[PDB]
Amino acid sequence: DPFPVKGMDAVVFAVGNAKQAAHYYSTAFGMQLVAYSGPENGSRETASYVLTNGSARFVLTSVIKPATPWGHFLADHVAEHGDGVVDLAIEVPDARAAHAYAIEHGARSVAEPYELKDEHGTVVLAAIATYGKTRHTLVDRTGYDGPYLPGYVAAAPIVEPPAHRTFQAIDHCVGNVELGRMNEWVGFYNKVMGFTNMKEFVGDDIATEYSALMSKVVADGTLKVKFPINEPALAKKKSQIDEYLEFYGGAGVQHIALNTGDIVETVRTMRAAGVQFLDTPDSYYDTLGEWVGDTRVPVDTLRELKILADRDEDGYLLQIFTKPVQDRPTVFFEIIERHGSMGFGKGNFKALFEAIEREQEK
Amino acid sequence: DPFPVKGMDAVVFAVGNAKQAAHYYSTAFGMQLVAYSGPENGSRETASYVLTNGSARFVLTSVIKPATPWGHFLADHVAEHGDGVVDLAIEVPDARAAHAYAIEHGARSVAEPYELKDEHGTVVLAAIATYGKTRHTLVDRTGYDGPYLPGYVAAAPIVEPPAHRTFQAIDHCVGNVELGRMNEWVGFYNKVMGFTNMKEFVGDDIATEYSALMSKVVADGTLKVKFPINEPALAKKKSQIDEYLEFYGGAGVQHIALNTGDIVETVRTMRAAGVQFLDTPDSYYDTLGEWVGDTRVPVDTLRELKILADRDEDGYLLQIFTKPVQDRPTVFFEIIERHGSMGFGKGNFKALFEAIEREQEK
Ligand SMILES: O=C1CCCC(=O)C1=C(O)c1ccc(C(F)(F)F)cc1[N+](=O)[O-]
Ligand SMILES: O=C1CCCC(=O)C1=C(O)c1ccc(C(F)(F)F)cc1[N+](=O)[O-]
Ligand SMILES: [Fe+2]
Ligand SMILES: [Fe+2]
């Protein structure tokens, strides 16, 4: 009500080779190029590709020859953190209202409300800062009907789209922060955006023995925009969050979860298109039926495809994670098919731990 | 004879994201991953992918976290020049003999002869500097039979290979140097490697009227290794060599040409796989029959796929150029099919110029 959001406008990646990245997400991930902005249309400093899959939208920008503060920012970001997210854009009914609200409540401004206008309409943009070097651009595109944003031109798919759509929406966007900074960012979203803490959290219990991490997730009123916040935790095993902060060079987006209507078909398509996922211990499946019960996907194909599952009091979910999409063990993706569960797979930390422990006896 | 060369051992690219670059070359270019070296096998600083297609071999290397002189060099090179070639490796029968010969005749040593050994044998490596930041690793792998080089492990293809092999060898590698430095570098190969000039060249006539570039070509005795050297020239066309030098930030490899036994099938596979080639004016095919004569491929299909052709006293060749593989207007590739001609398609500068002029009048 006081800080209304319509959903994620786009996940903007600052990358070293936008042309090849756009090819990767088109083929490996099955997305489709719909808009572009570069030298061929008068935008000489950066090349920007807009890929889409249902309502999921990724923007891949790369600086050609730095000349403005933004250009120099991207160049430095890519060199320092490697390919990663710089903007978790949020669509709002009113950018000026949202910006003022966020600033009145403590947020730091990255961009004052401004307007872009072309033959397709007007778009009001505003931006505030969140963890590390990441920002949230507040986008009011109610008066625009073009390809993406004024300055962008329609573009054709780099390749034929896959027979079955790989994904159709963004479920959640996860951020990794330093130890001791989780609750601070959680409070930030509660205050600055009027978000609400969801029931599911990864507490000290699971944190120190199975996950090596603590998490809490904030979401808007409609439960569309969901932002889980991870932080390292001491366990017997090295923390994947610490490894992230170490190789990324600070706080940043760890992974983006994408909704699919058929995770089985999504994985078959993605695997054949060249994407590798995590290797789930086969013994995980031996005891899956005992704690998760029956699923719409028989255990044999979950086992064949390395797909995971989790069950809570509201239902269940099917999930799978890709390996990092760069060489730095930093950002990766998650494909998720929900069936009642509103969780994030917290039960798999223990399940996989105990599953590994018994592969080690065989 | 005093500097025998077996051919191109590999063309090593320094990239910002080796994962996605390997996927790009596997899918768009149709190559297969055969070897790998990264954190997973004990090589913590860099991730390196070896791609192959016939005798053509590309090595895509990316630094994860720089810790050595080589790692820091890779990181710097990528930030300063964008994705590009850092090594035109040449296979030799004796890496020590070749390194001593090069250094005696003027070359700057970049790496003294050293040996790498593992379960698959021994390789002797040496290295000298060429234009810009490029080097030539002199490789003696006569006593090695593994995946690529000691330290690399066998790898499976990222995806299933295309029905028809896209290309099978490296025809030539072109370097772009500054104004007035062409003859210096052609001289360098004549003196340091014993290469002699081919007759094929682009000068006075072509340069200041059609090409906006001057070019000479050195080659070894067996003519397997070919190195055309380009420099900028003044015409009423902004020079593409100037564009390269400006956005790349100095001299460096402009393009690698690749042999295909069937350019029609190659272009069909590559086009469906996502690669875009230069847009050849339709009017080029109207008068093509007049100056180039009959070809094994009918003009109707050459026109459809935008494949070019050229003829000389020895025969003809069929060729096509890809758009650059990064956002910077720098490196690109060429697919070539020879039929007697020892040329490089210089006849197409006049042909394309007049074809463009014709499409304009209408
Ligand atoms: O999405 C989230 C937010 C809460 C913390 C978290 O770990 C999230 C995961 O996507 C998740 C959940 C479970 C697992 C498991 F157990 F399978 F390894 C892994 C991840 N994960 O890698 O993000
Ligand atoms: O390979 C060479 C070396 C000599 C100079 C040269 O232009 C080379 C080409 O591959 C070439 C030839 C013709 C054309 C044309 F006319 F089609 F535009 C383009 C290129 N080229 O972009 O390298
Ligand atoms: Fe998740
Ligand atoms: Fe060429």
Side-chain angles (χ1 to χ4, degrees), chain A residues 1-103 105-111 113-190 192-198 201-208 210-235 237 239 241-356 358-360, chain B residues 1-43 45-103 105-190 192-203 207-208 210-237 239-312 314-349 351-358 360:
Chain A
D1 183 86
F3 188 87
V5 300
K6 324 226 288 105
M8 294 306 288
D9 195 71
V11 174
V12 189
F13 294 81
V15 305
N17 192 328
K19 211 222 201 62
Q20 289 186 11
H23 186 276
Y24 180 74
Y25 287 101
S26 288
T27 63
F29 283 54
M31 305 182 85
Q32 26 275 345
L33 178 71
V34 296
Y36 167 83
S37 176
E40 305 94 306
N41 58 261
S43 173
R44 115 199 167 245
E45 181 184 28
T46 61
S48 190
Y49 298 75
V50 184
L51 289 104
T52 233
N53 222 357
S55 66
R57 179 200 273 142
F58 292 178
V59 182
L60 312 167
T61 317
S62 185
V63 38
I64 302 178
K65 192 158 195 178
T68 62
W70 175 244
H72 276 100
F73 171 72
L74 297 169
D76 294 352
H77 196 277
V78 173
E80 166 167 21
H81 312 275
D83 295 1
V85 183
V86 293
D87 185 2
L88 284 177
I90 310 173
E91 183 185 2
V92 293
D94 183 359
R96 292 164 189 297
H99 185 276
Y101 189 100
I103 302 308
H105 286 85
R108 174 187 128 227
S109 188
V110 163
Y114 63 101
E115 302 188 323
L116 294 188
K117 192 175 194 187
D118 76 353
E119 81 217 80
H120 302 290
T122 302
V123 166
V124 187
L125 273 11
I128 58 164
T130 185
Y131 49 79
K133 261 91 163 271
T134 310
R135 50 144 81 40
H136 283 304
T137 296
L138 306 172
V139 187
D140 171 16
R141 52 168 65 251
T142 56
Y144 175 86
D145 56 85
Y148 170 50
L149 282 181
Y152 284 79
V153 173
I158 291 162
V159 297
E160 187 65 45
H164 314 284
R165 270 217 316 237
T166 45
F167 50 92
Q168 68 202 59
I170 294 177
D171 191 270
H172 52 274
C173 306
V174 190
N176 279 174
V177 305
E178 302 85 352
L179 171 59
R181 303 269 180 101
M182 172 187 80
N183 288 130
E184 178 195 313
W185 287 108
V186 159
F188 167 81
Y189 287 107
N190 276 251
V192 169
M193 302 186 131
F195 277 12
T196 313
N197 297 25
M198 289 183 86
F201 65 91
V202 188
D204 189 77
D205 16 284
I206 286 155
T208 48
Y210 311 121
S211 73
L213 69 87
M214 268 193 93
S215 186
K216 289 195 186 187
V217 23
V218 302
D220 80 292
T222 65
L223 246 17
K224 262 189 102 153
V225 179
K226 293 172 228 179
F227 292 148
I229 305 293
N230 297 167
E231 147 191 300
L234 182 53
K237 42 169 280 180
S239 188
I241 304 313
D242 268 327
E243 180 170 72
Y244 177 98
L245 300 167
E246 185 191 350
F247 284 95
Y248 193 81
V253 173
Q254 177 202 38
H255 76 270
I256 307 290
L258 314 162
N259 303 98
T260 188
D262 189 356
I263 195 159
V264 175
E265 210 42 63
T266 291
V267 180
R268 290 190 158 132
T269 299
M270 286 180 79
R271 278 206 150 99
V275 9
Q276 281 164 309
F277 302 82
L278 295 185
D279 192 51
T280 297
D282 197 284
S283 70
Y284 163 90
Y285 298 94
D286 288 337
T287 69
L288 189 58
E290 327 190 1
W291 67 285
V292 143
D294 249 59
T295 276
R296 75 114 187 141
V297 179
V299 292
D300 284 339
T301 126
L302 289 176
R303 158 188 268 107
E304 182 216 333
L305 270 22
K306 302 306 190 167
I307 299 164
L308 311 174
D310 199 13
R311 168 178 295 290
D312 65 0
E313 37 163 271
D314 296 275
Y316 72 89
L317 68 73
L318 302 177
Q319 61 183 169
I320 188 152
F321 310 86
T322 72
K323 294 223 265 152
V325 299
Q326 325 77 19
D327 299 292
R328 302 197 186 198
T330 52
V331 357
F332 57 92
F333 292 83
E334 174 191 359
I335 297 301
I336 189 173
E337 180 177 337
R338 296 185 177 285
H339 283 107
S341 178
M342 259 156 72
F344 302 82
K346 158 183 178 175
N348 281 310
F349 288 114
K350 175 179 166 196
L352 293 175
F353 177 98
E354 295 182 350
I356 292 184
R358 45 175 196 274
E359 279 281 311
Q360 298 173 349
Chain B
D1 168 55
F3 195 99
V5 304
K6 302 264 216 66
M8 294 306 293
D9 196 71
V11 15
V12 192
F13 291 77
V15 299
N17 192 328
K19 238 251 191 47
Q20 292 181 14
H23 187 273
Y24 181 74
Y25 286 107
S26 292
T27 60
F29 279 54
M31 312 180 78
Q32 10 284 348
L33 174 74
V34 292
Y36 170 82
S37 183
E40 300 85 342
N41 51 271
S43 178
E45 186 186 35
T46 61
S48 191
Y49 299 76
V50 185
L51 293 94
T52 232
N53 221 3
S55 59
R57 184 200 266 137
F58 294 171
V59 178
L60 316 168
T61 313
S62 182
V63 59
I64 304 195
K65 196 183 196 180
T68 64
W70 171 247
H72 276 101
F73 164 73
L74 287 184
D76 287 357
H77 195 289
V78 173
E80 174 176 26
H81 313 284
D83 290 359
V85 181
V86 294
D87 181 11
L88 291 176
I90 298 164
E91 187 192 352
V92 299
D94 190 331
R96 297 178 185 276
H99 180 251
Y101 184 97
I103 304 300
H105 292 60
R108 176 185 139 240
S109 177
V110 157
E112 290 290 307
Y114 60 102
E115 295 174 352
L116 297 188
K117 181 165 198 189
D118 77 354
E119 51 179 297
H120 302 107
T122 301
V123 181
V124 197
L125 279 346
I128 74 188
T130 187
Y131 47 75
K133 259 77 182 274
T134 308
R135 43 141 80 40
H136 282 304
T137 300
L138 311 179
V139 181
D140 167 19
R141 49 169 66 257
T142 61
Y144 172 88
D145 67 353
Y148 172 48
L149 285 181
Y152 282 74
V153 301
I158 289 169
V159 301
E160 244 250 305
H164 167 255
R165 166 142 101 344
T166 54
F167 50 95
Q168 65 201 340
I170 290 169
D171 190 87
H172 61 269
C173 312
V174 184
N176 266 2
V177 303
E178 302 87 338
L179 169 74
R181 306 281 178 247
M182 169 178 84
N183 299 143
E184 177 178 321
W185 285 109
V186 308
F188 168 89
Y189 285 106
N190 282 337
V192 171
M193 300 190 162
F195 287 7
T196 53
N197 300 44
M198 291 180 85
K199 44 143 163 23
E200 295 77 30
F201 73 93
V202 186
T208 41
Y210 305 118
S211 71
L213 78 88
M214 279 208 58
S215 187
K216 286 187 172 152
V217 188
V218 298
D220 75 292
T222 67
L223 251 72
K224 216 193 281 67
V225 178
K226 274 174 282 180
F227 294 147
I229 300 295
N230 299 341
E231 83 163 18
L234 263 103
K236 265 148 210 196
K237 187 188 183 195
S239 181
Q240 197 178 54
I241 309 304
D242 280 312
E243 185 160 51
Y244 178 97
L245 302 161
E246 188 196 343
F247 291 103
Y248 193 81
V253 176
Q254 186 209 41
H255 79 274
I256 301 294
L258 317 157
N259 307 88
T260 172
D262 185 357
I263 194 159
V264 178
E265 203 49 35
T266 292
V267 172
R268 274 176 168 143
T269 300
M270 289 175 81
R271 224 165 221 134
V275 25
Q276 272 177 284
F277 296 89
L278 294 195
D279 180 3
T280 289
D282 205 39
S283 64
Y284 166 91
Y285 298 99
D286 290 326
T287 62
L288 188 62
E290 284 164 26
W291 67 285
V292 79
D294 277 327
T295 265
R296 76 150 192 104
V297 190
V299 287
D300 258 20
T301 65
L302 286 176
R303 153 180 282 137
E304 186 216 346
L305 278 3
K306 321 292 175 139
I307 301 164
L308 311 165
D310 200 10
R311 130 135 29 241
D312 63 357
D314 316 277
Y316 75 93
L317 64 84
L318 295 178
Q319 64 179 175
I320 192 173
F321 302 91
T322 77
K323 292 225 255 169
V325 295
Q326 340 55 216
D327 313 279
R328 299 190 186 202
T330 54
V331 359
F332 60 90
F333 290 88
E334 181 197 348
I335 298 305
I336 189 170
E337 191 184 309
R338 302 182 171 283
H339 289 271
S341 176
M342 288 159 62
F344 298 91
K346 84 104 173 282
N348 280 311
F349 286 118
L352 252 356
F353 179 85
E354 298 185 349
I356 280 165
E357 196 148 67
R358 235 174 288 136
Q360 271 163 204

